[PDB]
């Protein structure tokens, strides 16, 4: 999540108020974190399918780097839970083996 | 026929409101010249 | 009808009483199992951990 | 046989409940551990803020 979804509720395709789809795609490309040079290269494209394919490829290219980071985070965190949880079990081994035995 | 604006690291995507705050005060002369 | 309902409550409560008591007596006949065995169970638990 | 099966079911059930009580007990004891540290820490911080 980057921007609010209310703008998406404002300009929906089924309301037919989208008189400028190319601007909607530009508004959606505004959500991209891509470099200004990438925006200019998308602007160099003249055909609609070519700039749409480039804007979608840019959207996915940011989505790849993001997904790699989120996966790496959840991985390290789960490694921490695995770390501590067995210590809790070992801690139980202790607490069941001080006064018992 | 106006001097070029100092974008100064501020992308402005199409149909997307954006604010610009250049550190230079010379653009303020251009804003007053357009008032 | 109230007496028959009370009579049903009596005969049923007596059967349930015998069943609850027989079950309690026999669960006691398993409680006769020594506390050493319980300490053995816990001992096995002492063996059953990560390592 | 049905009644014996019930006696076996409760027989295991007691051992289970013993394991569960021991576990929750140990975990809570950990919570008393850490929690009291949270209290001692609060005393420490309030001391730093004045004294």
């Amino acid at each position: 999540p980057l921007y609010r979804e209310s703008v998406l509720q404002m300009m929906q395709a089924g309301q037919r108020v989208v008189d400028n789809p190319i601007y909607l795609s530009d508004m959606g490309a505004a959500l991209t974190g891509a470099e200004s040079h990438e925006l200019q290269d998308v602007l160099e494209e003249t055909n609609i399918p070519k700039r749409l394919y480039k804007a979608l490829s840019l959207l996915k290219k940011e989505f790849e780097l993001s997904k790699l980071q989120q996966r790496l985070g959840r991985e390290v965190e789960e490694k921490i839970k695995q770390t501590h949880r067995k210590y809790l079990l070992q801690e139980q081994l202790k607490i069941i083996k001080k006064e018992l035995g | 026929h106006l001097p070029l604006i100092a974008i100064t690291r501020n992308p402005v995507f199409p149909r997307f409101i954006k604010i610009i705050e250049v550190k230079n005060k010379k653009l303020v002369e251009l804003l007053r010249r357009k008032v």
Side-chain angles (χ1 to χ4, degrees), chain A, chain B:
Chain A
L2 300 171
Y3 204 52
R4 300 180 296 274
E5 74 278 5
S6 60
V7 300
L8 202 161
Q9 309 285 359
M10 182 179 72
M11 64 184 73
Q12 186 65 40
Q15 294 304 334
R16 182 60 179 85
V17 305
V18 187
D19 297 338
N20 300 268
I22 187 166
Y23 298 166
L24 188 158
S25 68
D26 297 332
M27 170 45 205
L31 304 178
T32 63
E35 294 184 1
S36 307
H37 180 55
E38 297 299 344
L39 308 171
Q40 184 63 11
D41 301 0
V42 171
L43 290 169
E44 288 178 357
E45 301 292 350
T46 61
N47 309 116
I48 305 301
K50 292 193 175 176
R51 57 179 53 186
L52 284 173
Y53 171 102
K54 200 172 279 189
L56 166 71
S57 302
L58 287 189
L59 276 162
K60 186 175 182 176
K61 187 177 186 170
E62 310 294 314
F63 185 56
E64 292 177 348
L65 162 60
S66 48
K67 167 177 287 182
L68 163 58
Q69 294 170 203
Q70 288 100 36
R71 294 181 302 89
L72 207 55
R74 59 170 182 72
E75 175 178 350
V76 168
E77 290 202 339
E78 287 298 348
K79 288 174 175 178
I80 298 162
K81 309 309 177 289
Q82 295 147 15
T83 311
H84 189 45
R85 188 186 309 92
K86 272 74 78 184
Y87 168 77
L88 309 175
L89 310 178
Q90 185 173 357
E91 191 181 16
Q92 290 166 315
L93 177 147
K94 305 316 298 183
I95 297 187
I96 302 177
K97 193 69 189 52
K98 277 78 71 174
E99 53 91 37
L100 182 59
Chain B
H1 294 86
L2 288 178
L4 309 178
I5 303 301
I7 295 93
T8 307
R9 310 184 175 283
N10 271 310
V12 187
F13 306 93
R15 302 292 180 173
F16 199 76
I17 306 173
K18 279 304 288 202
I19 315 183
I20 286 180
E21 296 182 6
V22 178
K23 279 71 68 178
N24 304 331
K25 303 179 179 179
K26 304 177 181 180
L27 298 186
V28 181
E29 301 298 347
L30 172 62
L31 297 180
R32 295 190 317 174
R33 281 191 309 268
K34 57 176 80 173
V35 177

